[PDB]
Amino acid sequence: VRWQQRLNNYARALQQLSLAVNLAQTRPLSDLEKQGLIQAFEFTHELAWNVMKDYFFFQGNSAITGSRDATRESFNKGLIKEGEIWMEMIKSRNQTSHTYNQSVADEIVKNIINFYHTSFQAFLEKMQGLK
Amino acid sequence: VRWQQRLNNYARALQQLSLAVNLAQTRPLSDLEKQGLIQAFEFTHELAWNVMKDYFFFQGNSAITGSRDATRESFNKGLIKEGEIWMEMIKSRNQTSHTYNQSVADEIVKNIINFYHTSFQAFLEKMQGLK
Amino acid sequence: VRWQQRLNNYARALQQLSLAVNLAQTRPLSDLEKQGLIQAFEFTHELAWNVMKDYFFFQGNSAITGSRDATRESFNKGLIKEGEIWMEMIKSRNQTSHTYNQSVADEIVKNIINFYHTSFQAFLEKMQGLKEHE
Amino acid sequence: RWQQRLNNYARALQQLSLAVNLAQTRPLSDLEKQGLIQAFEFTHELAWNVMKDYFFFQGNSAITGSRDATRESFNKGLIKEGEIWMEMIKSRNQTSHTYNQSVADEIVKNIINFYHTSFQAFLEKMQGLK
Ligand SMILES: *P(=O)(O)OC[C@H]1O[C@@H](n2cnc3c(N)ncnc32)[C@H](O)[C@@H]1O
Ligand SMILES: *P(=O)(O)OC[C@H]1O[C@@H](n2cnc3c(N)ncnc32)[C@H](O)[C@@H]1O
Ligand SMILES: *P(=O)(O)OC[C@H]1O[C@@H](n2cnc3c(N)ncnc32)[C@H](O)[C@@H]1O
Ligand SMILES: *P(=O)(O)OC[C@H]1O[C@@H](n2cnc3c(N)ncnc32)[C@H](O)[C@@H]1O
Ligand SMILES: [Mg+2]
Ligand SMILES: [Mg+2]
């Protein structure tokens, strides 16, 4: 029940992230649109690890508390394949207060486009199949 | 001095937020640009309350635990005038994981444009006068 | 065999749970003893579904992500008979943080004594048999 | 609201306190030792959720789980004994193994000798904060 509602909101959020990633593949993003892509990454990643946590609670695991726990357990049980990429997302979340520096904003944007988006899509497909 | 270094970065972040606020006064923002305005609010507010915390720490106050404490102390010591607006900023910060919903995003955007931008400008002028 | 080694630990855990259940059939438990019965249910259920997961992995099924997956597969394959009871166990596990409320503690304790203990014992017998025959 | 979470924390801690007091007066049975561990687990779960709720009230919505909450509470002075609060998380992670008498005895020892006092200090600190 609760995990499937979270999954639906995750899909909605990721759809907005995907639109921004597809726009970035068409033309360069403005500095303001880059900040918007980073915000879409923040709300998509937040939903994603909460889908993990909710799913494991549905499975009867109430030991997961945070995003690192949820990510580790997802890798251990095969919900994700790229454990290191998902751990890197947590590091990127911890940098978003520094994106008023163009170099930080560019580096997060590159990781979102080059790695995080496809990982989000794979996780969505995996959880939809479990649902 | 740390709080003055923090203030210089606050000024750079506020300059970026102001570009986006001034753009929003002249035409509708796209959905992605709205999220970027929210991200610029996030990094500008995070710098602003850390200026407050650093400044009061430099004056010998070590009891500030977070942005609400910093805001309360700034109101009591005259660093801000619009106490309720700065408290509303904290409520906005705590909603940013929900900005994939249009109702939420448009509410934060409206507050940034109508109230927070000028409150940030007033704080910049106050702190520069202390520097 | 890994699932058989897990089974031995499950049997040891269940022996401790049974001591407490049989004490609870004899006199009322104190509030603290009720918390202990809940903790023994938690370590016994944890072993039980890991026996399930281990067994199904040995059989060729590696798609089990946690106790609900394990319980569904055990019910489908006949390792357990009372599917609703084992699913209620998962709801009780997920109530663990709330047992400082006396009504929650009393509810889980009632379920452990009236339903879960029997199911744990039947599963032990079933898996012991699978060491020797199908 | 963090203050309602704090009220529940105080209620849970009162139960743990009565169990620790009991253990100071006589040996606990094996079943009572498992109960003491369970009461530690629901008290610790409330404690780090107080920490998370409090920092959310302060405007920090980045804290996710118990390690984050404990680290931020230490950094901001809500707790002083960071090592003990980090040991509590280690003990929580051992919960499935307390049917081994040596595991249970070790957690019980830490609850009585260290965790109870730290829980009390944290209650006092948070009460002072509102
Ligand atoms: P925030 O505290 O995230 O950033 C402050 C640090 O970034 C350095 N920095 C980067 N880019 C600049 C420019 N253009 N001007 C001044 N400082 C900059 C600061 O030196 C801090 O280390
Ligand atoms: P996130 O977990 O913040 O959102 C989940 C809940 O948001 C509500 N919701 C769904 N669809 C919308 C739209 N279009 N606008 C505003 N809010 C929405 C539902 O209650 C979700 O469960
Ligand atoms: P304590 O466990 O009372 O913490 C208060 C919050 O937990 C929720 N709550 C109490 N009891 C339960 C059960 N049995 N299941 C799920 N959630 C529970 C309250 O609603 C408070 O939010
Ligand atoms: P039971 O859960 O004891 O399973 C038997 C095996 O689990 C390992 N084990 C026992 N106790 C612990 C703790 N405290 N932490 C991690 N692993 C544990 C041993 O390998 C047992 O033989
Ligand atoms: Mg953001
Ligand atoms: Mg327990």
Integer Cα distance of D122 and C130 in angstroms: 51
Asked whether C11 and C18 are in contact (CB, 8 A), the reply is: no
Closest CA to D54 of B94, A106, C96: B94
- List, in order, residues 6 or more apart from C71 with CB less than 8 Å away: C49, C52, C80, C83, C86, C87, C89, C90
Q: Is B82 on the interface with A (CB under 8 A)?
A: no
Which residue has the CA at smallest separation from atom 16 of ligand 4?
D94
The full set of domains in chain D, from first to last, is: 2-129 (1.20.120.330)
Integer Cα distance of A41 and A120 in angstroms: 10
- List, in order, residues 6 or more apart from B114 with CB less than 8 Å away: none
3-state secondary structure of D29: coil
Show residues of chain D in contact with A67, CB under 8 Å: 64-65
Does the beta-carbon distance from D66 to A66 stay under 8 Å?
Answer: yes
Angle at D47 between CA B94 and CA D87, to 5 degrees: 115
Long-range contacts of B95-98 (CB under 8 A, 24+ apart): B96/A39, B96/A42, B96/A43, B96/B38, B96/B42, B96/D61, B97/A42, B97/A43, B97/A46, B97/A47, B97/D61, B98/A43
Kindly state if the Cβ of C98 falls inside 6 Å of ligand 3.
yes
- List, in order, residues 6 or more apart from D105 with CB less than 8 Å away: D33
Integer Cα distance of B27 and B23 in angstroms: 7
Closest CA to B10 of B111, B128, B110: B128
Closest CA to A18 of A99, A122, A131, A128: A122
Does the beta-carbon distance from D64 to A63 stay under 8 Å?
Answer: no
Structure tokens belonging to residue D7:
């009220």
3-class DSSP string for A55-117: HHHHCCCCCCCCHHHHHHHHHHCCCCCCHHHHHHHHHHHCCHHHCCCHHHHHHHHHHHHHHHH
Structure tokens belonging to residue A80:
């994700």
Integer Cα distance of D70 and D42 in angstroms: 16
Structure tokens belonging to residue C107:
């509810």
Residue C122, class by beta-carbon neighbours within 10 Å (0-12 exposed, 13-18 middle, 19+ buried)?
Answer: middle
In angstroms, what separates the C-alpha of C92 from chain D's closest C-alpha? Answer: 14
Residues in the ligand 4 pocket, defined by CB under 6 Å: C 9; D 94, 96-97, 100, 103
Tell me the one-letter amino acid at A101: N
Closest CA to A53 of A75, A73, A78: A73
Residue D103, class by beta-carbon neighbours within 10 Å (0-12 exposed, 13-18 middle, 19+ buried)?
Answer: middle
Structure tokens belonging to residue B60:
């010998």
Residue in chain D nearest B64 by alpha carbon: D76
Residue that the structure tokens 């988006």 belong to: A117
Closest CA to A38 of A79, A99, A82, A86: A99
Long-range contacts of C122-126 (CB under 8 A, 24+ apart): C122/C80, C122/C81, C123/C48, C123/C51, C123/C74, C123/C79, C123/C80, C124/C7, C124/C10, C124/C11, C124/C14, C126/C79, C126/C80
R_g (Cα) of chain A, nearest Å: 15
